[PDB]
Write a protein that binds this DNA or RNA. Structure first.
Ligand code: MG
Ligand code: MG
Ligand code: MG
Ligand code: MG
Ligand code: MG
Ligand code: MG
Ligand code: MG
Ligand code: MG
Ligand code: MG
Ligand code: MG
Ligand code: MG
Ligand code: MG
Ligand code: MG
Ligand code: MG
Ligand code: MG
Ligand code: MG
Ligand code: MG
Ligand code: MG
Ligand code: MG
Ligand code: MG
Ligand code: MG
Ligand code: MG
Ligand code: MG
Ligand code: MG
Ligand code: MG
Ligand code: MG
Ligand code: MG
Ligand code: MG
Ligand code: MG
Ligand code: MG
Ligand code: MG
Ligand code: MG
Ligand code: MG
Ligand code: MG
Ligand code: MG
Ligand code: MG
Ligand code: MG
Ligand code: MG
Ligand code: MG
Ligand code: MG
Ligand code: MG
Ligand code: MG
Ligand code: MG
Ligand code: MG
Ligand code: MG
Ligand code: MG
Ligand code: MG
Ligand code: MG
Ligand code: MG
Lengths: 117, 144, 64, 201
RNA sequence: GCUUGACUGCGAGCGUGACGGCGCGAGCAGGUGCGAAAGCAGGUCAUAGUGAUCCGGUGGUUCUGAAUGGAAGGGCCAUC
RNA sequence: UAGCGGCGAGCGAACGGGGAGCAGCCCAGAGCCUGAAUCAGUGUGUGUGUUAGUGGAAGCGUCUGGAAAGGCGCGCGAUACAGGGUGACAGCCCCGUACACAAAAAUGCACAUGCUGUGAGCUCGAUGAGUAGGGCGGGACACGUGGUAUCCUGUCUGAAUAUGGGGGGACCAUCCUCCAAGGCUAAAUACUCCUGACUGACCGAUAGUGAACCAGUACCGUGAGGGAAAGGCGAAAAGAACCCCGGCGAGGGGAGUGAAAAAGAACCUGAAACCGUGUACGUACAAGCAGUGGGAGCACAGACUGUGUGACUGCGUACCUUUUGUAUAAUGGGUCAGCGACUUAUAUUCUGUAGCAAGGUUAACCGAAUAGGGGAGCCGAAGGGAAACCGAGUCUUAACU
């Protein structure tokens, strides 16, 4: 029962290499290196799905701060006012509104200011 | 019922451990031997009753007694064996023919174990008190 | 081939009704006059093998 | 138990234990597997590093050359070295308890009767030792893949069978569970069925 | 002052040890000592004063005894 | 198991039982009757092998295709559908196979028979002496000198002799059993350099023999000795006439063969490392495990999404091993391809599962053979005690509350 292992071994290697397409040098050519690279990429991807959520929130906050200040109120104050006013618009949407609809954002800011004081 | 429809009972065949076939297997690199010691080694381990050097129990404790050669040629019979013979006489030869006692068995005892219903004549055998009473109740006879 | 018995173990241990092992106590072999009579008396009867060393004894005596 | 016959349309009484018991699949499976194992031959052998033809001298000195440390040219991790766990000829024959075997046979027989794969007849003799005649008889009986079990040993029948690979003629003494399961239909003579009952009990 | 409890067989039940073991123990049976008696006594105020197994030695024995009767040897108990 | 054993590690019977096979004889010796059974050689006849061989059934049409043995139709043989070939997979094309036959000659084994040697039966005897024992030293018996029986003998001794002697595990008595110091003897048992047939949950060119090949070769070594690598065009050479470039080269382009020459002998398939040519995009102000998340632009493919690239940007110090702890400046790896490590046998225990169940199961072996016989044995249904022994109890003790 001499199970020769050429076909399986090559298929396995090929799958890993294909996954490692687009990597510089032996990381896309040489299995040992490619496999190492592929595993590393997987790890990074897991990390970065989390980091992606973090990053985008950061961006939205930055944009909202810029817009609110243009309408004469800091971000923290603006958020507090909105919370007080019971406005549940999340800051992805707020950022989008700020970028594409200045009138709407201004209205929101006015609401926050009124609620605040 | 074809030769490709039969199947074993569930739990009959179990998976055979294969050591050292990768991480997912469970029994990975080391093969369930831990890390480098004597037991880890191929051929590794210590003989039966070895205690690192401590005088092993089978030596600590004193030898005792002797083996009886008459015990090897004694035997113990049951009332169910008094029924397992054929006829109504229980000698050594009869018991041996029945296949109850071993061939090189000079002596045998009938013990109160099981029960005897038919009347049997125990000849030339030792019989315990309970067994004797039981046989008599059955309607038997004991003689030397 | 057949597993061989540890003959020393065979000499020192005997199996009981449920599958224990009785054994003779140590220390009742020589210098006795200093040992107290009570101690000697207690050592005299046989004794069951403890839970700790039962496994070792079993390994020693596979046909017991 | 009662099997109606094909040729006379007359009943034949048999034991409920033998021909009407439950199908114990696990038992049957074990017996068939055992049969297969027994049938295998098991003649092979590789060479261990002991047996591989070569000198037992150290290919190079333990230290110094910088090469990895080698001891024998016959090492299993060397090309043209021994097989690590080289095979020897071995006996794959499993034991089967007599009762277990008999029970399996009983189950198979019962299954056949239930599934209408056991056909009982009064007599299945061919006149000449001619394959053509046997084939015609089988066609007339509608049959193609079949185990013809006969009580008394018949020369014409055996010879006629010999060249039909779908057909197999056996003596009632020489039935086997794999054969019964394998053959599409099983045609037993009345004497054969009676004999089988006596055998199995 | 008188004595040999520096008893023999056991021992509910505990303590302490991985185990080998080691320790405390009321009470029961037999037989004793002191006490008028109740009682106490199974060594010493307690905790060190010690060495497993094997192999032998000595004494006893209602065990065994390689055809049989013995014997040797073995076992068991005490001890070196 | 009983035993042996620094009573350690280990070694390890016998009695008795079941099988295979079973064959008993002769000389220490002379009288009789005496070519008397048996055995061996040697001629002859018969039978059956062996060493060459002979015969050996039955299929065409059509489609695809380079080619049919394949598809689809309709037939036939089969005591032959084992197997191998033939342009793809053939019971019926070829060689065979089942079955039936065959030997001038040589020879194996049977009987039958002739010749030579060989000696059967009766009565009377006789019954292996430097031997058995012993002392000393060793060795063999499961038995290590131990209480050590038995066997062998290097050394020194040394009986009795059937009115006798050996053994029965120190030794003595009784009883039983046998007759040493002289031989022969088939079968069942062991093995395979070699010959034939057949088989494989054996390998399929780094495997299987070291050796599929001109291999114990090349090569290495003074020598003993060590010891490789290396298989495949095509169905058939039909192996490329002729022309051209080139050195009357190598190599190549046509031509031709072929089903196919990106099947051209550096020949089936033809992966990966590695090296090129072409196209798209990126890249010459930019600092690090080279990815990942976000992401512009550009190119392409279709009707915006797929693909390719990735400016810029957040995060981010390989893998294994070994360690309290490794980016570690600790180990290992240049890469790829192939191979490379928890197996096997037998005992034992526990778990699952199947069978039967106070029973379960057979081993050798026999066997028209994985059937059926075979229950010799083994485990269990009773333990206690060191043991005799007792026994649902038993041991302890004079006895146990
Ligand atoms: Mg695990
Ligand atoms: Mg794990
Ligand atoms: Mg483990
Ligand atoms: Mg390691
Ligand atoms: Mg360590
Ligand atoms: Mg360890
Ligand atoms: Mg090793
Ligand atoms: Mg028996
Ligand atoms: Mg003592
Ligand atoms: Mg050497
Ligand atoms: Mg090899
Ligand atoms: Mg059988
Ligand atoms: Mg008084
Ligand atoms: Mg003191
Ligand atoms: Mg010792
Ligand atoms: Mg000694
Ligand atoms: Mg003594
Ligand atoms: Mg006696
Ligand atoms: Mg005696
Ligand atoms: Mg004695
Ligand atoms: Mg011919
Ligand atoms: Mg032909
Ligand atoms: Mg055709
Ligand atoms: Mg082809
Ligand atoms: Mg003689
Ligand atoms: Mg002598
Ligand atoms: Mg002597
Ligand atoms: Mg002698
Ligand atoms: Mg004797
Ligand atoms: Mg190849
Ligand atoms: Mg080679
Ligand atoms: Mg080669
Ligand atoms: Mg020139
Ligand atoms: Mg040319
Ligand atoms: Mg080709
Ligand atoms: Mg090629
Ligand atoms: Mg390539
Ligand atoms: Mg630039
Ligand atoms: Mg740089
Ligand atoms: Mg795109
Ligand atoms: Mg980046
Ligand atoms: Mg660690
Ligand atoms: Mg360190
Ligand atoms: Mg770190
Ligand atoms: Mg490093
Ligand atoms: Mg490493
Ligand atoms: Mg390195
Ligand atoms: Mg197991
Ligand atoms: Mg089980």
């Amino acid at each position: 029962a001499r199970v020769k292992r050429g076909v399986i071994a090559r298929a396995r290697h090929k799958k890993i290499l294909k996954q490692a397409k687009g990597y510089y040098g032996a990381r896309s050519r040489v299995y040992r290196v490619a496999f190492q690279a592929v595993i590393k990429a997987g790890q990074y991807a897991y990390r970065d799905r989390r980091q992606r959520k973090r990053q985008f929130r950061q961006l939205w906050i930055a944009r909202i701060n810029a817009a609110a200040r243009q309408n004469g109120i800091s971000y923290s104050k603006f958020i507090n006012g909105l919370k007080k006013a019971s406005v549940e618009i999340d800051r992805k949407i707020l950022a989008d509104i700020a970028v594409f609809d200045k009138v709407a954002f201004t209205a929101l800011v006015e609401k926050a200011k009124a609620a605040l004081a | 019922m074809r030769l490709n429809t039969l199947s074993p009972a569930e739990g009959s065949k179990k998976a055979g451990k294969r050591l050292g076939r990768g991480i997912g297997s469970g029994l990975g690199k080391t093969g369930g031997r831990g890390h480098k010691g004597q037991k880890s080694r191929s051929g590794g381990g210590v003989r039966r009753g070895f205690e690192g050097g401590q005088m092993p129990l089978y030596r600590r404790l004193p030898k005792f007694g002797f083996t009886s050669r008459k015990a090897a040629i004694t035997a113990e019979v049951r009332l169910s064996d008094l029924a397992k013979v054929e006829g109504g006489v229980v000698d050594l030869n009869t018991l041996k023919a029945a296949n109850i006692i071993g061939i090189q068995i000079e002596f045998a005892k009938v013990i109160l174990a099981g029960e005897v219903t038919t009347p049997v004549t125990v000849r030339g055998l030792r019989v315990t008190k309970g067994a004797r009473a039981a046989i008599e109740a059955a309607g038997g006879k004991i003689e030397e | 081939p057949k597993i061989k018995t540890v003959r020393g173990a065979a000499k020192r241990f005997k199996k009981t009704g449920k599958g224990g092992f009785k054994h003779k106590h140590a220390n009742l072999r020589h210098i006795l006059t200093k040992k107290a009579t009570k101690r000697k008396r207690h050592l005299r009867p046989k004794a069951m093998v403890s839970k700790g060393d039962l496994g070792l004894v079993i390994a020693c005596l596979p046909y017991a | 138990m009662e099997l109606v016959l094909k040729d006379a349309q007359s009943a034949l009484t048999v034991s409920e234990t033998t021909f009407g018991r439950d199908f114990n699949e696990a038992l049957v499976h074990q017996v068939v597997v055992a049969y297969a194992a027994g049938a295998r031959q098991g003649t092979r052998a590789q060479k261990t590093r002991a047996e591989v033809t070569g000198s037992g001298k150290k290919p190079w000195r333990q230290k110094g050359t910088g090469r990895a440390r080698s001891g024998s040219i016959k090492s299993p991790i060397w090309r043209s070295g021994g097989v690590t766990f080289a095979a020897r000829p071995q006996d794959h024959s499993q034991k089967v308890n007599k009762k277990m075997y008999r029970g399996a046979l009983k189950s198979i027989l019962s299954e056949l009767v239930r599934q209408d794969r056991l056909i009982v007849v009064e007599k299945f003799s061919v006149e000449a030792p001619k394959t053509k005649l046997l084939a015609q008889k089988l066609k007339d009986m509608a049959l193609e893949d079949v185990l013809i079990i006969t009580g008394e040993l018949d020369e014409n029948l055996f010879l006629a069978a010999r060249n039909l690979h779908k057909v197999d003629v056996r003596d009632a003494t020489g039935i086997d569970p794999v054969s019964l399961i394998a053959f599409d239909k099983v045609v037993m003579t009345a004497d054969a069925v009676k004999q089988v009952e006596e055998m199995l009990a």
